[PDB]
Amino acid sequence: GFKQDIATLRGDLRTYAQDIFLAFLNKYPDEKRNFKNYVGKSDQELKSMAKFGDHTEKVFNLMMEVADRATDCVPLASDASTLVQMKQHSGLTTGNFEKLFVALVEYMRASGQSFDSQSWDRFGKNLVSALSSAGMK
Amino acid sequence: GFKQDIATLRGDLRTYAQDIFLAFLNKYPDEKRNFKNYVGKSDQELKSMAKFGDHTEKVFNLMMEVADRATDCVPLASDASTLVQMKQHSGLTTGNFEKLFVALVEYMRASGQSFDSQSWDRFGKNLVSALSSAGMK
Ligand code: HEM
Ligand SMILES: Oc1ccc(Cl)cc1Cl
Numbered sequence: 408g409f410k411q412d413i414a415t416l417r418g419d420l421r422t423y424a425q426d427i428f429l430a431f432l433n434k435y436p437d438e439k440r441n442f443k444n445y446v447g448k449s450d451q452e453l454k455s456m457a458k459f460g461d462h463t464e465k466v467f468n469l470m471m472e473v474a475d476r477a478t479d480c481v482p483l484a485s486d487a488s489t490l491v492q493m494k495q496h497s498g499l500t501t502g503n504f505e506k507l508f509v510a511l512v513e514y515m516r517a518s519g520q521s522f523d524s525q526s527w528d529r530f531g532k533n534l535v536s537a538l539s540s541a542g543m544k
Numbered sequence: 545g546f547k548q549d550i551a552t553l554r555g556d557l558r559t560y561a562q563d564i565f566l567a568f569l570n571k572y573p574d575e576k577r578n579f580k581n582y583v584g585k586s587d588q589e590l591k592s593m594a595k596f597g598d599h600t601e602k603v604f605n606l607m608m609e610v611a612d613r614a615t616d617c618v619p620l621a622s623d624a625s626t627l628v629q630m631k632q633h634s635g636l637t638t639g640n641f642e643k644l645f646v647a648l649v650e651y652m653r654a655s656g657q658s659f660d661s662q663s664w665d666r667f668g669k670n671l672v673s674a675l676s677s678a679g680m681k
């Protein structure tokens with residue numbers, strides 16, 4: 408289930424963080440505009456860039472903590488406030504987050520592993536609602 | 545305290561994992577004999593090798609799972625048994641583990657972050673005692 412999925416992802420975190428972020432960026436090419444330096448690069452080139460590896464790992468490290476602190480796939484309101492108050496997320500909307508979780512769930516469904524994709528879909532929806540309550544447009 | 549420390553360490557897992565492993569290896573040079581692929585290389589050389597970062601991340605991730613499952617800094621006997629039974633740990637003794645935790649506590653005290661170094665010291669002592677009870681020499 409959901410809790411075991413967190414353990415699975417953490418056990419190969421750099422690989423999953425990069426694979427999932429790349430799936431997001433290739434499913435939604437417009438989202439690359441939020442990173443500027445990622446345009447015109449293939450996946451293998453991105454994976455060789457310092458800020459790409461460091462950044463995807465930090466995103467995923469924190470995403471797994473938020474997932475781990477949730478109850479029944481509902482994140483804590485304090486974790487949602489943190490994500491909203493981050494300077495780096497000024498200019499983001501909940502739509503950016505919704506798209507991340509659509510790609511993550513699709514990636515899980517296609518991997519052939521025993522992920523509880525339905526719990527991740529609920530988690531993403533519940534996170535987006537929490538982000539709005541915390542003030543994100 | 546202990547639980548926040550786990551969150552702090554997990555938030556930047558690869559960076560802490562590398563720095564703590566290097567602190568251990570440089571404090572206890574003889575221990576590097578267990579890691580024949582890392583002999584003859586400076587800290588910066590090791591950090592440039594993908595296999596070093598991957599190895600340290602996987603170890604440290606499991607250490608944080610064990611710490612998170614502990615009650616009052618006492619690890620679960622099942623987690624201690626897992627560590628004893630791993631093939632990669634054939635030939636190790638509790639002494640190797642004690643030295644790791646000395647280096648880890650020394651790293652925390654020196655870092656100038658508000659780690660609960662006393663709790664990591666207790667955790668390391670209780671883990672060493674649990675490894676004995678699970679069959680490690
Ligand atoms: C609580 C502490 C520890 C945990 C959680 C842990 C866990 C692990 C894990 C998950 C691996 C496999 C990582 C990989 O795939 O490369 C591993 C491998 C290994 N560990 Fe441990 N370990 C711990 C302590 C130690 C200590 C103290 C030593 C020796 C001083 C040690 C020696 C080794 C060796 C030699 C390998 C094989 C590495 C290789 O073949 O490249 N471990 N350990
Ligand atoms: O910016 C990111 C880095 C890693 C992951 Cl998994 C998702 C996002 Cl949006």
Ligand SMILES: Oc1ccc(Cl)cc1Cl
Nearest residue numbers: 561564565599600603604
């Ligand atoms: O082999 C290791 C990798 C990372 C850390 Cl923190 C400790 C050890 Cl023994």
